[PDB]
Each structure stands twice: as structure tokens, then as C-alpha cells.
Amino acid sequence: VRKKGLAMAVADRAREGKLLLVEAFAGVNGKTKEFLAWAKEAGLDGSESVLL
Amino acid sequence: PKMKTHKGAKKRVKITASGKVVAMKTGKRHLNWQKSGKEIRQKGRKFVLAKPEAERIKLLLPYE
Amino acid sequence: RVKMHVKKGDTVLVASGKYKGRVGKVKEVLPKKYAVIVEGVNIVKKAVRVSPKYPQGGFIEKEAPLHASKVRPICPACGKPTRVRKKFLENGKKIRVCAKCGGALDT
RNA sequence: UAGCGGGCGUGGAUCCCUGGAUGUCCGAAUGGGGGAACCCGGCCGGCGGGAACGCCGGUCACCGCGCUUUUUGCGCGGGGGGAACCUGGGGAACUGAAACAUCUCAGUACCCAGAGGAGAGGAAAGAGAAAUCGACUCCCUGAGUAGCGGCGAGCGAAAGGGGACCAGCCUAAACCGUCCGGCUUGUCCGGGCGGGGUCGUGGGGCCCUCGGACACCGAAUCCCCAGCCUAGCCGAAGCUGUUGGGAAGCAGCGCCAGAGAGGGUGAAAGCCCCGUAGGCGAAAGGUGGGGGGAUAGGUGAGGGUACCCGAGUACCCCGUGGUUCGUGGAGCCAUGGGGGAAUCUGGGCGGACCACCGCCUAAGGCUAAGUACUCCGGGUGACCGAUAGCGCACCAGUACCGUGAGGGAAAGGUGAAAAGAACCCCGGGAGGGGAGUGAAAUAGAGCCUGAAACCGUGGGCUUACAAGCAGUCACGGCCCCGCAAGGGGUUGUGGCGUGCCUAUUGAAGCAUGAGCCGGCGACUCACGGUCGUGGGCGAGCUUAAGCCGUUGAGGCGGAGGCGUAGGGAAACCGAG
């Protein structure tokens, strides 16, 4: 059951289209504006919350 | 905690593993003398049901 | 332990709410209940006819205290939270990159 | 926590951290006391001039264990408390059985005592069916199974396996060396002390034999250092205007981030104050195998002899607790009496007992670890907001109850901040009328809110020929809202009418609960079953303890229960 759970849920997100697995994150030191400009570039904005 | 199977009726009854509680015939102990074989071969087994639904319950946990 | 605040009895502005943007004076730290008596809360008490210290005229007050979270630093600029450094020897607290503790006299 | 009043610090006070210090009188009280916190006293020593009065510091009750020539005595400890957890020493009744004695409740509450962070326990006369494992406590399944019983109520375990955890040993006795005792001197009986050994194809002793060896391992012990706690240190980014009493809220631009946890800042801030992530920190003290030095200390093969291996015991009986065992064919452990072994063909067990085969070496001892709990430190919650919450939110084990053991309350909020109301006025004051204060005094001092029952004062309608579970339907009088239409209200008349709840064959009942109101207050859950149901699954399902991770983050762990064959009570026969 719960196996499929994740699957279904996660895969259902995929049905919408809101998803991606970047090869490697450009902001390599863990600092805010790195990932921030990175996100503005990676299809992000601000009003959308991230099981990231 | 875990309900206790009634050791007694457990130690003294049958129910065919389909759900039909079928028991053992009595009135057979201190008689026999002026009686006949008719009562003998009849006093060999028994039946029952309906309230042995409540008795089917009393068996409980291992059902049996 | 660490009743310690950040305000020193010298001179500092007041970004309050009562008389907002009022020039804050010598300040007088009082006490450990986060408060200050700058030169501000001006009212008047209904003191009695108390013949000695209050002759035939009794209806007067000057500067009453106030809250300590109502002021901000001062330097050749404005407030902005103070940064402290160990000077190697002493312990000067220069302002937001803008220099000098705001109290001075060899620090 | 105010006034009076006087001091102290950048020669770094207060404040927090540590160590010591002064530490009176009570209290195990401990010199003797004694009705607790009071009254006396002895010896060492001192001060007042101090031999009589008095103080100061010293010293003293008892038990045990270990020494001292009995002696003079020296020595270390003891004794008290403690909420829960803890081991033993005694041991209830109510109840269930729809009575009630067997039984149960339960060896449970409760009394004693002691032990410590632990304990308790603990290295095998084991466990039990196979030539199987191998101290202890803990979690799980085994399983309500195996057992138990006026075979009623009901009570009710162990192996196996899946994990936590890991730990092993001190001895006596064989033999030997010494000091002591005594004695029927003697190739001696008992004692203190060192060597000696520790058991399952037995272990050593003693002599003889193999070759016994640098080493090889190494504590529960010694000591130290990383750390850990008792205080801290620092630490990211903003303004202008705007309504408002007050902005943090309204717009304009800008900003920190490993930190947009939270509280507070006159309200609602990531850049106001306190802080959050991160990063350092002990001079003195306490705590720690984490790492190591070190230390106590541990290891061989063989022949013979014929030495010892735990004595008022095991073993039989009797009276028996515990365990599934309520005495049954009744085992094993433990023990009160009586009978009373041996030292390995010795002993105990394999559920009465005898035969065959296996298990393990008794009657002396110490053991960390995981267990258990909450006086307590911090941390959290689909926990509560002054009838709730702990009994105790505020000086609650205070009031006050009773000699007494013991009972057991009530009682919170002004504001951002006291600015907590001078001066006039009436008044003895009290309290108010003004003023003055703040945003506001409908926040005015047990003062945010202020209801209900509730007692007043004004007004509208109605009432002084009238028969009432108090209203209802209609109509008129009326007064006031209304553009209309209508609406509130009120009752002048007349048709209709035996309160509520409980209880009852059945109530207006002259059966009862109830004065009125505010509030508190009763069908839940924990295990398992059982029918129906929503879904994943499919002859398949699903893990339990736990472990890995987490900081509201999940996955992993197949022991096991479920399901396919039942039928005979059984051996067992098998879709029969």
C-alpha cells in the first residue's frame, strides 16, 4: 500500500508537470542568493513551496 | 487483556469447522438396565444449534 | 545574569512612537526592567501643598522614564544596530561599518 | 518596596560561576537531661582584680568490626532521612462464583527492616530429545498456549525462536612452610598466616615423566588528556512619507540569510529590543576507560599412586510454601521435626518408581551491561486557562475544623507607562460635584470585559361588580414607529385550555424532585472478538520487539499470527 502511496502521490505530481531533477545545483556552497538567482533561473518565482 | 477461552466447553464440545456447533448426547450414565439397545445406539452422539451461536462465540480466539 | 542591554548613558536618538524622532539626550539607564529616562516623558503630578519642598505652588513634574526598546544607536549618521569588536585589547563598539562607539573619550 | 538617609565604582563595584569562611539553639542529638529549640555538668585551657559569680574554644552516649600484656586504651565505620523504583520478613477484607467455606480477589493493598543508583539476580546436580544449546536481568512471539478447578467462577506458565546486552571469577579441602595453643612430648589435636587448586573426554595433590620456555594475553584497579556541567563571548540586513492616541499595518524603493524559531517593542517587524543558525569558552570545582601508559593477574602434554573436592547436608518420613500443579500417578526447588551418606561405578535430574541412555558436579562466595522508576535539570504537546488546571496562578499545606491523628478553603488582569487625580466646593469624615491627566476615567484604584437571575427610578398601555397552569383565536379601545402596505406593542370582550420531569395498568393529583439564575456535570477508552464497511492484496496477507534515520521525516527489520482438509477424543485415515 504505502509503497504505491509515495509512487501514486509523487507520480501524480508528475501528472501536473511541476517537477524536475537537476543534474547538479549551481549554488555550490549553500548560500541563499546562490540558490535564489539559481531558482529564478530554474523556473522558480516565490509563490510556490518546495518539497525541494 | 486477551479474553480467556472458556477451558470447559472447549474441553467438552465440537463444532464442524464450517460453523455448526454439534455436541454430545447425555441422559446416558446411570440408566442402562431396564432400557434397551434402541437408547444405546441413539445415545452415541448429538447435534444442536441456534444458542450454540452464543456458544460458537464462547469458544472464541482459536474458534475451533 | 545578562540583565545586560546595549545602551550606555551618553547620547542617542529615539525612534519611538510617543514623540517619535525626538532628539534623545544623556539617557540615564534605569534599570534592569528594560527602560530609560532620556529627557522625554514630560507630564505633571498633582503633588499636594507640601509646605517645605512645595510651598504654595504644587503642580509640577519634568522628565519621567520610558521603555528601553524605544531608542537606537548614534554616530556620525543614524541608528542601525551596533557592532562590537575586541580591539585586541579593549572592547570598542563601532557602528554599522560607520566608525566609533558613539561614546568615545579614547575608544 | 516607597520615603528618610549615606555610600560605591572603567585603582573595573552590584550581578552571575567556584572554593573555602563565619556557621549560635533545636533535630539520629550523641555528656546527663528534658514537656523540642530549655536546664544543669565534669576534666584540658583562657578573661574579667577573679579563690566563690560567668563566658569563650577543647573534650564526653551507644553498637559493630580490627588491633593493644587482661591493663592505659588506639583504630575505621556505624546510627538519620528518601516521592517513585528495590529485595526479603508478616499478611488482610470487600468481590467474583448471581448463596457460599474449596478457590478468587493476591502474596495485592498494608506493617517492619535494610540495601543502591540501581538493585535483585547471576556461571549450571542447568535447559530437554536431537549425539541441542550453553551465566544474569530486558523486549518480543511462543499462547490465554501447556496446565489448574464444588473439572463452576475463574486462574493460568516454560522450552524453541526473533533481538537488547555481553563477563568473567574469589575460595575451601587435597599438600606444604611458618608463628600460637594446649597436651595423656608427641614422627600430636585445634588455631592464625603464606603457598597450593577450582572441576566433566573429571579436576588437581605428591613424586616421577615430556623441555620448559623470551613471551602472549592484561582487569572490576592506578593515573592522566580530548570532552562533559556548574557563569558567559560574539554574531547577519532601512529609510522616507501616510491615516491613527499609538504603527510593526498603507504606498515607493532597498536589504540579511547556515539565521522567515519565539517573545516583546503603546497593536500585526526577517533589517526596532531580547534574541535564532553558526562559531569559541574554565582560572577553581565536579564528571568521564573515549584513547593510552601502568597494574592485579591468566596459558602445556604424560604414568602411577590411590590423597581431597564443600555434613546435621543430600537422602527416607512427617507437617509443607512456590510452580501449570486446589495433593492428583505428583515431579523439582525451598524447610520445621525426627531417622541420618559418600567423596567419581561417588551424587542429583530427565514428572511416582525399577531397567537402558543422556544432562550436569551440589550443599561458601563477587559481577558491570541492557531492566525499573520519577524528589529533580532542561526539552516538547491535534494539554487547561482562575468552578479548568497539581490541593496550592496572588505569602498554600496559610485560613480555619477538632485536644487529637488528621481535614482542607478562598483569593488573578487599570494603563504604553502612575501621568495613579493637586486646587475650589458641600461635607465630621466618608464620598462626591468641578477642574486637571491620558487615546480614553463606561480604564478611577481589588478599576479591561460587566451578562443572567436581581433590586430600583421615568415613561407608554392596562387595572378599584370581579372566579385566575395566567395563555391562546378574533374583534374593538389605545399609544408609538410607517410613504404605501404594514409593524411593534398593549389589553377592552368572548369561544377554547387538568404545569414540567420522574414514577406508573393509570396523575391536576392531596405521590415527588424542584425558589429563582450563572456556571461544573454522566455512554469514553485499553485488549480481543465479532458482523457489516472503505480500500492495497491475491492463494496469498501482514510484521512484533527493535534497528537505521529524523527534529512533527521516514524507511528497514518475516520471528510470528492469518489462509489453503478436514474427519476420529486418540493412534491416526485422508476428500474422505
Distances (CA, A) of C71 to B39, B45, C8, C33: 111, 101, 11, 15
Q: Which residue has the cell 520610558?
A: C66
Distances (CA, A) of B35 to B8, B41, B45, C3, C47: 30, 12, 17, 106, 123
Q: How far is CA B18 from the centre of its chain?
A: 15
Closest CA relative to residue C60, chosen from C49, C47, C48, C78:
C47
Looking at the DSSP assignment, which residues form a beta bridge with residue B15? B21
**Which amino acid is located at B23 in the chain?**
A
Q: How far is the CA of C17 from the C1' of D448 (A)?
A: 23
CA distance C40 to C62: 9
C66 closest-nt by C1' vs CA: D417
Does C23 contact strand D, using a CB cutoff of 7 Å? no
Does C72 contact strand D, using a CB cutoff of 7 Å? yes
Distances (CA, A) of C67 to C14, C29, C40, C79, C84: 11, 10, 11, 17, 23
Q: How far is the CA of C22 from the C1' of D112 (A)?
A: 79
Does B54 contact strand D, using a CB cutoff of 7 Å? no
Give C51's Cβ-side CA count (13 Å radius).
Answer: 0
